[PDB]
């Protein structure tokens, strides 16, 4: 990709890679990548998190844990390291621990695995909040897809890889085809 303008003047280019730095990821320094138009991944060192955007909610506020404060996230994940990782991610999405609706998660004591749920439905008291959380996603994942249908339900689900709730989606066939993008990490740094 180099051509000549003048007899000596020449068009030249250079391509940079941040992968040697994105590989040294950690909870405070997450590497963010997009797989499907429905699967996203955050690698924070030893803790990997699958993020999904669907219309399928498995949690209810009448049965599951409501997270009003970051500390409540300790009830959602097997380790507190992951708890603060998800705290910083929630901040990065634009969630307001003081004003926005509380998110839902599954008590870590249960058998089904970790699952944090955001109601991003385009309807009723979930509409406004919803858009924000999608904007955050658009900032944190280049090329984010908006599968949420107007007037219908939509949810963002976070599952820590390793728990039963990750199913087989955290396998090697997935994370090996999820190129890290440093622009996402820069947006995470700025928004948190």
């Amino acid at each position, epitope marked *: 990709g180099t051509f000549k303008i003048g007899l000596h003047t020449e068009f030249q280019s250079v391509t940079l890679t941040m992968q040697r730095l994105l590989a040294n990821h950690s909870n405070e320094c997450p590497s963010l990548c997009m797989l499907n138009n429905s699967f996203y991944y955050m690698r924070g060192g030893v803790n990997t998190f699958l993020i999904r955007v669907s219309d399928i909610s*498995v*949690l209810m506020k*009448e*049965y*599951d844990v409501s997270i009003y404060e970051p500390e409540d996230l300790g009830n959602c994940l097997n380790a507190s390291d992951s708890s603060w990782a998800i705290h910083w991610f929630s901040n990065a999405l634009g969630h307001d621990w003081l004003m926005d609706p509380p998110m839902l998660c*599954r008590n870590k004591t*249960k*058998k*089904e695995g970790s699952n944090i749920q955001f109601n991003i439905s385009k309807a009723d008291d979930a509409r406004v909040y919803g858009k924000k959380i999608r904007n955050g996603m658009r900032h944190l994942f280049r090329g984010f897809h908006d599968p949420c249908e107007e007037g219908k339900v939509c949810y963002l689900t976070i599952n820590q890889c390793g728990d*039963p709730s990750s199913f087989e989606y955290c396998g090697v066939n997935h994370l090996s085809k999820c190129q890290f993008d440093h622009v996402n990490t820069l947006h995470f740094l700025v928004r948190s």
Partner: antibody, heavy 120, light 109 residues
Framework: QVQLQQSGAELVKPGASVKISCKASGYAFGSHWMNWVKQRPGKGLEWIGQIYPGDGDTNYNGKFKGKATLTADKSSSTAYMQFSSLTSEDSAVYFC?????????????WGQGTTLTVSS | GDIQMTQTTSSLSASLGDRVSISCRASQDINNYLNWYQQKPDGTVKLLIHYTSRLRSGVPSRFSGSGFGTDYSLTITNLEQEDIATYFCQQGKTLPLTFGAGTKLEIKR
């Protein structure tokens, strides 16, 4: 589509053991708690225990601890309840029931029941 | 330490099209974690209402649940023939899970 098919009626003599079965269909057997319930005329419904076929953890009711033993087989998607030292007090109808995804402690799908009679 | 469920009425007579109420009382506050089951005369069992008043899919609208604390109630308006059955309540707060004794509905004449 979700179905729980229990084994047939049993007639045993005192002091005997017996294993009743419950075959599940239509869902991930390892993702739902399988509970057992005992019914007798005029004695309502008694909760015996529950097993999680995923890891195999069992939670028993203190009253039935020692009388009942719960096992599971994921390949056959079949839960089993074994009774030991049966007495006439153990004659009843036994249901297997399923909790919903997660652990909501409500039984959304029931088997047809298995009649156990203990008599000399 | 167990939690006792009390369905004071064991039998209840009513004519088709009536409003029926079945009470359920808990020995401890169970925080709306009450569920209602229907048992037909053939032994069939089905969940109808969970968390006090949340209807399950397929349950006709004439069924409804109410209460909070220790006292709860299942209400059946416009009693249909197929509703003639026995109804049990169940607390889902703490193990061991416990059921009521049941309330059988019978037709009046």
């Amino acid at each position: 589509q979700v179905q729980l098919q229990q084994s047939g009626a049993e007639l045993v003599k005192p002091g005997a053991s017996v294993k009743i079965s419950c075959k599940a269909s239509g869902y991930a057997f390892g993702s739902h708690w399988m509970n057992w319930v005992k019914q007798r005329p005029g004695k309502g419904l008694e909760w015996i225990g529950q097993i999680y076929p995923g890891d195999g953890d069992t939670n028993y009711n203190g009253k039935f601890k020692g009388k009942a033993t719960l096992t599971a087989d994921k390949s056959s998607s079949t839960a089993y309840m074994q009774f030991s030292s049966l007495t006439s007090e153990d004659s009843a109808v036994y249901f297997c029931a399923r909790d919903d995804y997660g652990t909501r402690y409500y039984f959304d799908y029931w088997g047809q029941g298995t009649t156990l009679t203990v008599s000399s | 330490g167990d939690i006792q469920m009390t369905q004071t009425t064991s039998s209840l007579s009513a004519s088709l099209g009536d409003r029926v109420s079945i009470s359920c009382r808990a020995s401890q506050d169970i925080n709306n974690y009450l569920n209602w089951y229907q048992q037909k005369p053939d032994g069939t069992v089905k969940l109808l209402i969970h968390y006090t008043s949340r209807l399950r899919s397929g349950v006709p609208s004439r069924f409804s649940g109410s209460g909070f604390g220790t006292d709860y109630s299942l209400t059946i308006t416009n009693l249909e023939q197929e509703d003639i059955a026995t109804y049990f309540c169940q607390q889902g707060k703490t193990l061991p899970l416990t059921f009521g004794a049941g309330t059988k509905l019978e037709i009046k004449r």
